[PDB]
Design an enzyme around this catalytic site. Structure first.
Site, PDB file in Angstrom:
ATOM      1  N   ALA A   1       0.845  -1.187   0.000  1.00  0.00           N
ATOM      2  CA  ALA A   1       0.000   0.000   0.000  1.00  0.00           C
ATOM      3  C   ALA A   1       0.894   1.255   0.000  1.00  0.00           C
ATOM      4  CB  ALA A   1      -0.937  -0.026   1.197  1.00  0.00           C
TER       5      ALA A   1
ATOM      6  N   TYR B   1      -2.577   4.398  -2.557  1.00  0.00           N
ATOM      7  CA  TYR B   1      -3.125   3.075  -2.276  1.00  0.00           C
ATOM      8  C   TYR B   1      -3.369   2.777  -0.798  1.00  0.00           C
ATOM      9  CZ  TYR B   1      -2.933   1.814  -7.177  1.00  0.00           C
ATOM     10  OH  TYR B   1      -3.149   1.770  -8.534  1.00  0.00           O
TER      11      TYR B   1
ATOM     12  N   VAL C   1      -4.017  -4.628  -3.101  1.00  0.00           N
ATOM     13  CA  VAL C   1      -4.727  -3.986  -1.994  1.00  0.00           C
ATOM     14  C   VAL C   1      -6.025  -3.285  -2.442  1.00  0.00           C
ATOM     15  CG1 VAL C   1      -3.536  -1.716  -2.067  1.00  0.00           C
ATOM     16  CG2 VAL C   1      -4.343  -2.615   0.121  1.00  0.00           C
ATOM     17  N   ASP C   2      -6.119  -2.884  -3.714  1.00  0.00           N
ATOM     18  CA  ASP C   2      -7.328  -2.178  -4.211  1.00  0.00           C
ATOM     19  C   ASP C   2      -8.447  -3.187  -4.546  1.00  0.00           C
ATOM     20  OD1 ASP C   2      -6.399  -1.402  -7.664  1.00  0.00           O
ATOM     21  OD2 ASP C   2      -5.445  -2.783  -6.272  1.00  0.00           O
TER      22      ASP C   2
ATOM     23  N   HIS D   1      -6.983 -15.059 -14.681  1.00  0.00           N
ATOM     24  CA  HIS D   1      -7.354 -13.679 -14.963  1.00  0.00           C
ATOM     25  C   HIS D   1      -8.819 -13.641 -15.471  1.00  0.00           C
ATOM     26  CE1 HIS D   1      -7.272  -9.675 -16.752  1.00  0.00           C
ATOM     27  NE2 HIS D   1      -6.070  -9.454 -16.257  1.00  0.00           N
TER      28      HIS D   1
ATOM     29  N   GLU E   1       3.366  -9.424 -13.854  1.00  0.00           N
ATOM     30  CA  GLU E   1       2.416 -10.425 -14.341  1.00  0.00           C
ATOM     31  C   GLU E   1       2.888 -11.212 -15.563  1.00  0.00           C
ATOM     32  OE1 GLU E   1      -1.987  -9.673 -14.283  1.00  0.00           O
ATOM     33  OE2 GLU E   1      -1.659  -9.351 -16.429  1.00  0.00           O
TER      34      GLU E   1
END
Length: 264
Positions: free
Chosen positions: A60, A64, A131-132, A152, A222
């Site tokens: 974070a 964030y 975290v979002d 995904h 990713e």
């Protein structure tokens, strides 16, 4: 591994699959975790008898920090309830971390921005998330295994040619058009501490080689995660129940639960 006690539950039937609409096992014989594939009572027994501790890691940074309160509060409601949890919040603003009330056997550490020896001594599994997000339904021990990735939500129905892998052969994350099992999202992965440290050590090394060669993978962490998981097959895959965006993608019939979701 201790013996399970007597338990009364519906008999699994060999000629009646729970889910006929989705793939529930990979071709390397790893479970794909969908609602209806598991009895959480059996799984909770197995993991409690091992006295399992789960580490949950989030970063974070900057704006964030505003996502921590809902994240942690919903994690309290839905994440590994009944088991030992250690939250690891990495942040540049220790003082902006909210004081969230935690249930028994659960703790939070704020780490200011080193942790390898610490993770090994404190937790059995590490879960690495964005975290979002918020938890909206059960995320429990069904996910736990030596190494897991998550499908995904935009690509679970797509052919491998359409996956947004790194396609330039000059990157360490390179995957050709004729390769790939799934597109895994960077927002939710994990496993044993040992496997997660192997994964991140491999990813970091791959990223440094790219950096020396003057190249950045199309989707950053990713892209490298997807390369690692192609070459080291995860022992479970989580369905898109575990990483959803309801604003973007709705609530299709194939999803019986929306467990962990993006926040607008």
């Amino acid at each position: 591994m201790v013996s399970l006690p007597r338990m009364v539950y519906p008999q699994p039937k060999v000629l009646t699959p729970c889910r006929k609409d989705v793939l529930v096992v990979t071709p390397w014989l790893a479970p794909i975790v969908w609602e209806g594939t598991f009895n959480i009572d059996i799984l909770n027994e197995q993991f409690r008898l091992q006295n399992t501790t789960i580490g949950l890691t989030v970063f974070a940074i900057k704006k964030y920090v505003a996502f921590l309160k809902l994240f942690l509060e919903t994690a309290e409601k839905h994440f590994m309830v009944g088991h030992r949890v250690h939250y690891y919040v990495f942040t540049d603003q220790p003082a902006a971390v909210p004081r969230v009330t935690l249930g028994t056997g659960r703790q939070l550490s704020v780490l200011e921005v080193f942790c390898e020896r610490r993770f090994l001594s404190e937790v059995d599994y590490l879960v690495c998330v964005d975290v979002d997000m918020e938890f909206r339904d059960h995320v429990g021990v069904e996910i736990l295994t030596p190494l897991f990735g998550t499908l995904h939500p935009s690509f679970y129905g797509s052919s491998r040619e359409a996956f947004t892998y790194e396609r330039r052969p000059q990157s360490q994350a390179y995957i050709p058009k004729d390769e790939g099992d799934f597109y895994y999202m960077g927002a939710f992965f994990g496993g044993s501490v040992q496997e997660v440290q192997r994964l991140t050590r491999a990813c970091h090394q791959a990223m440094m080689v790219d950096q020396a060669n003057g190249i950045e993978a199309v989707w950053h962490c990713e892209s490298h995660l997807n390369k690692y998981l192609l070459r080291h097959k995860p022992t479970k895959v989580l369905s898109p129940e575990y990483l959803w965006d309801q604003q973007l993608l709705g609530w299709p019939a194939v999803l019986r639960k929306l467990r962990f979701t993006a926040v607008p």
